[PDB]
Each structure stands twice: as structure tokens, then as C-alpha cells.
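re: ur msg from earlier - yeah i can do the OLP complex, just paste it... oh wait u already did. ok heres what im feeding in:
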Amino acid sequence: NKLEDVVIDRNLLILGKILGEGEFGSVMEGNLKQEDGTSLKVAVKTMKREIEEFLSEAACMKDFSHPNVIRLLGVCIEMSSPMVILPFMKYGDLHTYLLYSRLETGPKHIPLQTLLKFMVDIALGMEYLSNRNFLHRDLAARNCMLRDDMTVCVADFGLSPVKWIAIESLADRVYTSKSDVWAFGVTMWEIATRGMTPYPGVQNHEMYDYLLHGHRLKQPEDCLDELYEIMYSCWRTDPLDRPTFSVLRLQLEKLLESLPD
Ligand SMILES: CC(C)n1cnc2/c(=N/c3cccc(Cl)c3)nc(NCCO)[nH]c21
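and the outut:
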């Protein structure tokens, strides 16, 4: 009964062209009409019956307030005869941006300093979420968006991927914010490599055993050992040994300082 204001009136909302389709749902561009009278550019995620439970998640998420975490604006429901509403991000997802940057006509070559900023942002977003005791469960560069001012924020959290999952979750189904810390390490690598799929040579079905024998992602070509140490700490076998997001965040910030201007 309480979280019912999270719901937005379907006619306040107008949908446009499709921006992508995964097996789950489809993401669309649209316009949301506001209190102002003004309209705001939004992105609309669709998915597919004990449903109340889902609504509470959106209610929770709506409470999130951090510049490095996306703000869910509300939800719509077209009656089964459910769509989440998020601010539109014109620069798109971080993964596709890294790839574009390796091409002419696309964004200039991202220098090291900017690659670190990217990671700091995500570290910060995850710091905040880890404090709220919120478990992400799908962190990857494809799920990090670029703001109009080139800030990175975290998106797609939860909503009900093998190469991003930590050993213990792969094995026992267990998942804690340390498992997210594992995903973050993989994400960092994605950025260091400017969009390589993790574990080249290793097929998905081999992943668990490849990790079980203590094998990790390899160090990228011209990567500082410091940066590599940091990402590697994210994948220590015991979750307890892995650093926390606030421990990580500060390491990246101090490293960024260490680099020339
Ligand atoms: C659902 C949330 C996270 N969201 C918010 N904005 C976007 C988004 N924006 C853009 C921006 C530039 C080009 C395109 Cl195709 C989509 N794209 C996507 N996805 C399309 C490519 O990954 N998702 C977006």
C-alpha cells in the first residue's frame, strides 16, 4: 500500500524508438511529463506472477541518491491484457564507449587518467550501495552509464553473466557484497583493456574449474603493477580477504594523484 507513489501514471509517459533488445526485455527512449509541466528525456526498460515483491525493489531503488548511482524515477504498468523509468544517458553504456574510443570518428583515445576516473566513479557508486547493504548482482561495464558530463554511474542493479561471477557464487550460490567486489575487479579490467571480453581463450563452461585451479585474469599490456595489484585483490579466493569498496575507492583516488597532471 505504502510504496504506490513509486508508480507513475502511464499517460504521463510517451515511448519512442527501441535502443536495444536482450533475451530479458527491451530498452526504449521516451518522454516523461512532470510536475513542472516540462518533459524529461528518459529510458524505459521492459520485462515480464507474485508481482508486489518486484514493486518494493523499485521503491527501495527510488530512495538511492548518489551522483555515481543512477536514480530510478518510477515504474509503469501496462496491464497484462511493467516498465522501469530512468533518466536518458546520451553517452550510453561505458562498455560500448570504450570500444568506440578505439575507433576514429568515435571519442578520442581515453588516456590513463580518464580510465582511472571511470573506475573511481564506480568505486564510489558501489561504496554507497555497500553501505545501504544493497547487493548489486550484475556489475559489469555494460551496466555502467556515462552522464552528460562524463561522470560514470552504476545501473541495472538486480532486476531478478558467468565471467563476472565470483568462485563461491559459482560453486555454492552464496552472494555477498564481496561477490560484487569480485565483479568490480572484472569491470576494472574491462576498462583497462578498453572492452575485451574477460578470459580470452577460456570458454564459459570452463570458468569454474579454471578459477578453481587458481587462475585469474591476466595483466593488460601497459598497465601499472599498482593498478593490477588492485584488481587482483578483488579476486582472492576467500571473500573475507578481498578489500571493501571504501578500501578500494581510496586506493584508486591516491593512484590517480600519483600520475602526472
Ligand atoms: C536503461 C538505462 C541504463 N539507460 C539510460 N540511458 C540509456 C541509453 N542511452 C543511450 C545513449 C546514446 C545512444 C543510445 Cl543507443 C542509448 N542506452 C541504454 N542502452 C542501449 C545501449 O547499451 N540504456 C540506457
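cool cool. The pocket of OLP is lined by residues 19-20, 27, 43, 45, 86, 88-90, 92-93, 96, 145, 155 (CB under 6 Å). ping me if u need the other ligands too
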